[PDB]
Structure 1
Amino acid sequence: EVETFAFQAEIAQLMSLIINTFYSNKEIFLRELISNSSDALDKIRYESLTDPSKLDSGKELHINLIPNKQDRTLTIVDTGIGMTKADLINNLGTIAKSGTKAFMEALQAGADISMIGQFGVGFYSAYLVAEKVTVITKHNDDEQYAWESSAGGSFTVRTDTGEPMGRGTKVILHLKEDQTEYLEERRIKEIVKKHSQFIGYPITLFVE
């Protein structure tokens, strides 16, 4: 069972801006997704402070970066709080309508696309480098779901009968053909060191 949804107009506009604007500094997508993962990790840590059973679905709080040159994917995995079905549908747990408005106003006043994360919509920077994004997620007390979109105004949601995750989120970037530098170990290492060097969770770059 696959459900197809339309993006809200403002989010479709955000995505079209990201996909169509000439902007060479694409590498910031990784900083933004790592930051989102850190935020998700913070959320489950906070819940666990008063209810340790929240970590029964996995105690380790970390981020994995997994390139796969055969599939042309870069996957960012975290063991954060995850998302419910309703969160997925609600713009991946964001306030993307108001955030998009604030980002657009900032762009008009001299900001650039690299500032996207200040507006709570950094996830969508994935579309700087990905033709399709698949998000697999598992929140405590909800089932595992897969969200997917190739932009074009719609996304899908289905229950994921794939490999179980204990808890967290996997963002699978199906890279554009000219963006395969982001599968190279030395390039990923460089970007992590430049933009994510103080993130307070382990970031493991897998090799192939």
Structure 2
Amino acid sequence: EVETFAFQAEIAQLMSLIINTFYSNKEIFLRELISNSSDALDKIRYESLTDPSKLDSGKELHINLIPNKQDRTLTIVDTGIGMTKADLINNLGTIAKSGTKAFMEALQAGADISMIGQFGVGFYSAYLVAEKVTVITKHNDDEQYAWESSAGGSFTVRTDTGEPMGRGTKVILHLKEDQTEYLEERRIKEIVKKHSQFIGYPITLFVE
């Protein structure tokens, strides 16, 4: 059973802007996704301070980057707090309608697409490099769900029967044919060193 939802018009507009604007500095999507993983990891750490049972679903707090040249995918996995079905549907827990508004204005008023994360919608920067994005997530309060979208105004949500993940979020980027540089080890290491060097959780880049 797959449920199909329409994006709110402001989110569709944000996505169309990300996809259509000429903008060379696409590598910033990786910093925005690691930053989102780091924020989700902070959340579960904080809840665990007063309730250690919150980590029964996994004690390890970390971020893995997994390139796969065969499937043309780059996957980011974190063991953060995860997202409930309701959060997934409501723009992956963001206040994306009001963030889009602030970001749109900043763009006319001198900002550029790399500052997206200052408006709380950095997740959508995945569409600088991906034709399709799949998000698998498990929150302590809910079942494991898979969200997916190739943009074009809609997204789907289903229960995920794939590998159980315990707790956290996996973002699977199905890369555009011309954006395979982001599966190269040297290129990923360069971006992580450039933009993500003070993230507080181990980032492991997997080998192929």
TM tier relative to shorter chain: over 0.9
Number of matched pairs: 208
What SS does structure 1 have at the residue aligned with 2:147?
A: strand
Give the aligned partner of residue 130 of structure 1.
Answer: 130
Tell me, in whole angstroms, the C-alpha distance in 2 between the residues paired with 1:59 and 1:106: 40
Deviations 1:19-38 (A, max 9, x none): 00000000000000000000
With the length of structure 1 as denominator, give the TM-score of the two structures.
1.00
Tell me, in whole angstroms, the C-alpha distance in 1 between the residues paired with 2:128 and 2:17: 10
Deviations 1:40-81 (A, max 9, x none): 000000000010000000000000000000000000000000
Deviations 1:159-186 (A, max 9, x none): 0000000000000000000000000000
What SS does structure 1 have at the residue aligned with 2:178?
A: coil
Tell me, in whole angstroms, the C-alpha distance in 1 between the residues paired with 2:108 and 2:177: 31
Q: How does 1:46-195 map to 2 (within 5 A)?
A: 46-195=46-195
Deviations 1:92-128 (A, max 9, x none): 0100000000001111110000000000000000000
Tell me, in whole angstroms, the C-alpha distance in 1 between the residues paired with 2:90 and 2:39: 17
Tell me, in whole angstroms, the C-alpha distance in 2 between the residues paired with 1:141 and 1:81: 10
CA drift of 1:141 comes to 2.2
Runs of 4+ in 1 over 6 A off after TM superposition: none
Unaligned 5+ residue runs, structure 2? none
Deviations 1:122-167 (A, max 9, x none): 0000000000000000000200000000000000000000000000
Tell me, in whole angstroms, the C-alpha distance in 1 between the residues paired with 2:81 and 2:111: 31
Q: How does 1:37-48 map to 2 (within 5 A)?
A: 37-48=37-48
Tell me, in whole angstroms, the C-alpha distance in 2 between the residues paired with 1:108 and 1:19: 17
1:7 to 2:7 alignment: yes
Unaligned 5+ residue runs, structure 1? none
Tell me, in whole angstroms, the C-alpha distance in 2 between the residues paired with 1:49 and 1:183: 36
Tell me, in whole angstroms, the C-alpha distance in 2 between the residues paired with 1:125 and 1:207: 25
With the length of structure 2 as denominator, give the TM-score of the two structures.
1.00
